[PDB]
Design a protein around this ligand. Structure first.
Ligand SMILES: Nc1ncc(-c2nc(N3CCOCC3)nc3c2CCN3c2cccnc2)cn1
Length: 839
């Protein structure tokens, strides 16, 4: 209690927000949730295996892709085992268990003391009843032509991740008045009061427009058409101040976490409006009590074939195809036929009249008979779709969370970022989903690691959602165990430390000075001495452990935002290299945007592994740490396409076609790896060409396009590029690119033919998962892109994915897009150089 009061203070520093600061609640939902989450946490903490939780094998059930079989020769793999320099290579079968590999090293190559296989230089273990092929580190070693190096050492003590013991009356609302302490011509204003479910306004009332003054009282009752008994759980009283223009909004759940109608008096601090967006939907009141508009209020008391075809044609349409009233009555009337087709649950449930108790009832008996949904194989795109903003009913959303239960960790990891983000569409703080995220975090340290940083990312920069997430993070941190609490402490300490330096250095300059490099050197020299902890997990690569600062190599970069280039010596002495761990720290870019996109890129890579494609993207690590502040992984041996041109040509001039290829060959040691490098370029250029085209970020300056010194090409800096007579492109396929593939003007090559057929295989792979990408893209815009003004923004994705077009004309459509890049040439890049130098 004296001890335990200190613990909460630790949690609070980890969390980044005090989940006990009860200034900003008009009720107790948070505490109720903090109290609700104790059971599922203790359940999973009681349920998990300590050994397998402690070493956390990262594995997968997915079948080893074709492109990695055709890199295995004579069905064996070469595991290089180490010890104290005493190393010995071993031919192992892909289907060998890892304990059954110790049988070879130990019981072959001349009661027992059980040990286990760890990856060299990493917190990564190949344990548990799984075949060597099915471990992701291996697949990664294969895919990148590397050698499986492991140390034969002891298990981690699984007692280091234990944790501390512990009527028919029409609904009416009385609008008393509104209150802004300072109000910056003249003005009139009214209060608009919408009754909402899932972005559908069930009912609406306005007040009369009074003059705009620091205080504006009405005392009017607003009676609504809807009956109290007709109000659905999850309905929001949404209140909004207009002047015609929206100025402020706030929301309040009409039915609360206890199934009680909301009685009594309320004073609600509201959110201003910049310039939909998931912030509009929060149940959270603005904490800033001295500068925020307030509002005060009171509450007291078998079918025709013609139709089947029409039903089928409705179920077939994309998720952004709006439903006419005609479409909805059809779905609803034939709801049981609709119940047989999973693809159609979204539209079917978007056709419920949620503001009518008896229909909602019908919807629930219609959910009692959901045998087909339960059995069907998980579609994530569909599952995601019932957890977006259009679904506010909890039972509807519960079936989506059900489908996620059957996801394996590897998959949960791909969709983690956007599931966390999906909590923002939950009506209540305690939900199936938030508990889901909690169980999977506690079941697996890898999921856990990234949860922490995903939650903490929002907590640090969303007033609208910090509290809710704070209770989810809090709950999780009381389950991970002492070790992780200790790791999270170390990483937090470090990034706070390095965040200081980044901002300091930014203030001290308006190019770079010798005085600043000095200042960096000094400030960073001091940090090293005492302040820094010994080592720490790299947040974007939790298996990797950074050690000391390679101060020699650290510098500050030549942008207008002056980021910090920092390198660290690795802390695992069994690391088979002296290569540093490179981390960029930047203030000024909204790297939440970079996160959502990199993780979509990772999702596309996995859409391609299903169709035996591997387009060699390098979606590097990015963790957004607070507001316009974060870290970026450094992909070693890489520079920009621009700087490569600046070597030969220089500061300005005619951007030449010869340079890229020369730089490639000039870096390759032999003409064996160069032709791999070129192969890599071909594949990597296509991947990014397609990925970026579909995401709408294909038109980039070559300053923001990069290439490794083994031919891997990759884009960077994804912030605020989705903005809104000028020359454009679908993607950057410049003459320098083409020159490396072997073409000019309208010529052709085999490498170009490989390119053209890689794209289309890629581009139609994505279109196989049209619906999935449409949802992910839609969610990305709402929860992470400020400037999400229109839904028209979302539609871009459907056009690019050419929905409602056959596989083949879609083939030709994409070839027309590449042809444009050929016909546009160097001009757009030149316009970018012009734009990025001339105002
Ligand atoms: N938002 C944002 N994101 C990334 C960068 C950036 N990143 C990186 N990385 C190094 C290689 O590993 C991948 C990351 N390099 C960058 C930038 C901005 C400029 N830049 C760079 C680095 C070296 C030479 N020329 C340009 C800059 N801004």
């Amino acid at each position: 209690s004296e001890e335990s009061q200190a613990f909460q203070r630790q949690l609070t520093a980890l969390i980044g927000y005090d989940v006990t600061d009860v200034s900003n609640v008009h009720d107790d939902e948070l505490e109720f949730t903090r109290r609700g989450l104790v059971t599922p946490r203790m359940a999973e903490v009681a349920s998990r295996d300590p050994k397998l939780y402690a070493m956390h094998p990262w594995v997968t059930s997915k079948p080893l892709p074709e492109y990695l079989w055709k890199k295995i020769a004579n069905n064996c793999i070469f595991i290089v085992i180490h010890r104290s320099t005493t190393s010995q290579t071993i031919k192992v079968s892909p289907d060998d268990t890892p304990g059954a590999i110790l049988q070879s090293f130990f019981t072959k190559m001349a009661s027992e003391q059980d040990f286990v296989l760890r990856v060299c230089g990493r917190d990564e273990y190949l344990v548990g009843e799984t075949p060597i092929k099915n471990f992701q580190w291996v697949r990664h070693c294969l895919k990148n032509g590397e050698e499986i190096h492991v140390v034969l050492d002891t298990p981690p003590d699984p007692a280091l991740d234990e944790v501390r013991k512990e009527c028919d009356r029409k609904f009416r609302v009385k609008i008393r008045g509104i209150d802004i302490p300072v109000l910056p011509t003249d003005l009139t204003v009214f209060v608009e009061a919408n009754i909402q479910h899932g972005q559908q306004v069930l009912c609406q009332r306005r007040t009369s427009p009074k003059p705009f003054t620091e205080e504006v009282l009405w005392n009017v009752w607003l009676e609504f058409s809807i009956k109290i008994k007709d109000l659905p759980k999850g309905a929001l009283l949404n209140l909004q101040i207009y002047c015609v223009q929206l100025l402020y909004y706030v929301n309040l759940l009409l039915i609360d976490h206890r199934f009680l109608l909301r009685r009594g008096e309320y004073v609600l601090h509201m959110w201003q409006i910049s310039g939909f967006n998931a912030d509009k939907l929060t149940s959270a009141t603005n904490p800033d009590k001295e500068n925020s508009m307030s509002i005060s209020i009171l509450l007291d008391n078998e079918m025709p074939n013609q139709l089947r075809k029409q039903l089928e044609a409705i179920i077939a349409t994309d998720p952004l195809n709006p439903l006419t009233a005609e479409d909805k009555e059809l779905l609803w009337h034939f709801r049981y036929e609709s119940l047989k087709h999973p693809k159609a649950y979204p539209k079917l449930f978007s056709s419920v009249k949620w503001g009518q108790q008896e229909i909602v009832a019908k919807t629930y008996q219609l959910l009692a008979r959901r045998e087909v949904w339960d059995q069907s194989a998980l579609d994530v795109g569909l599952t995601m779709q019932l957890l977006d903003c259009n679904f506010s009913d909890e039972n509807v959303r519960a079936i989506a969370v059900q489908k996620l239960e059957s996801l394996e960790d590897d998959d949960v990891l791909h969709y983690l970022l956007q599931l966390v983000q999906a909590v923002k569409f939950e009506p209540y703080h305690d939900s199936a989903l938030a508990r889901f995220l909690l169980k999977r975090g506690l079941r697996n340290k890898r999921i856990g690691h990234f949860l922490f940083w995903f939650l903490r990312s929002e907590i640090a920069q969303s007033r609208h959602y910090q509290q809710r997430f704070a209770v989810i993070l809090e709950a999780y941190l009381r389950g991970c165990g002492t070790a992780m609490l200790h790791d999270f402490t170390q990483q937090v300490q470090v990034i706070e430390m390095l965040q200081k330096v980044t901002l300091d250095i930014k203030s001290l300059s308006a190019d770079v000075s010798s005085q600043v490099i000095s200042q960096l050197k000094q400030k960073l020299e001091n940090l090293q001495n005492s302040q820094l902890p010994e080592s720490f997990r790299v947040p974007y690569d939790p298996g990797l452990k950074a050690g000391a600062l390679a101060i020699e190599k650290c510098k500050v970069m030549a942008s207008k935002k002056k980021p910090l280039w920092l390198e660290f010596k690795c802390a695992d002495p069994t690391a088979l290299s002296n290569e540093t761990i490179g981390i960029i720290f930047k203030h000024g870019d909204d790297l939440r945007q970079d996160m959502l996109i990199l993780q979509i890129l990772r999702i596309m890579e996995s859409i391609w592994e299903t169709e035996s494609l591997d387009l060699c993207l390098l979606p590097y690590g990015c963790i957004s740490t607070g507001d316009k502040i974060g870290m970026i992984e450094i992909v070693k041996d890489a520079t920009t396409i621009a700087k490569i041109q600046q070597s030969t040509v220089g500061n300005t001039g005619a951007f030449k076609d010869e340079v890229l290829n020369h730089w490639l060959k000039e870096k390759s040691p032999t003409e064996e790896k160069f032709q791999a490098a070129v192969e890599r370029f071909v594949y990597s250029c296509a991947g990014y060409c397609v990925a970026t085209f579909v995401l709408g970020i294909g038109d980039r300056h070559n300053d923001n396009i990069m290439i490794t010194e083994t031919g891997n090409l990759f884009h960077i800096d994804f912030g605020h590029i989705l903005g809104n007579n000028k020359e454009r492109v679908p993607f950057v396929l410049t003459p320098d690119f083409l020159f490396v593939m072997g073409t000019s003007g309208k010529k052709t090559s085999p490498h170009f033919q490989k390119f053209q057929d890689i794209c289309v295989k890629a581009y139609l792979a994505l279109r196989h998962h049209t619906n999935l990408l449409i949802i992910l893209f839609s969610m990305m815009l709402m929860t992470g892109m400020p400037q999400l003004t229109s839904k028209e923004d979302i539609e871009y994705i459907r056009d690019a994915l050419t929905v409602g077009k056959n596989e083949e004309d879609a083939k030709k459509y994409f070839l027309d897009q590449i042809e444009v890049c050929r016909d546009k040439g160097w001009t757009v890049q030149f316009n970018w150089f012009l734009h990025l130098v001339l105002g």
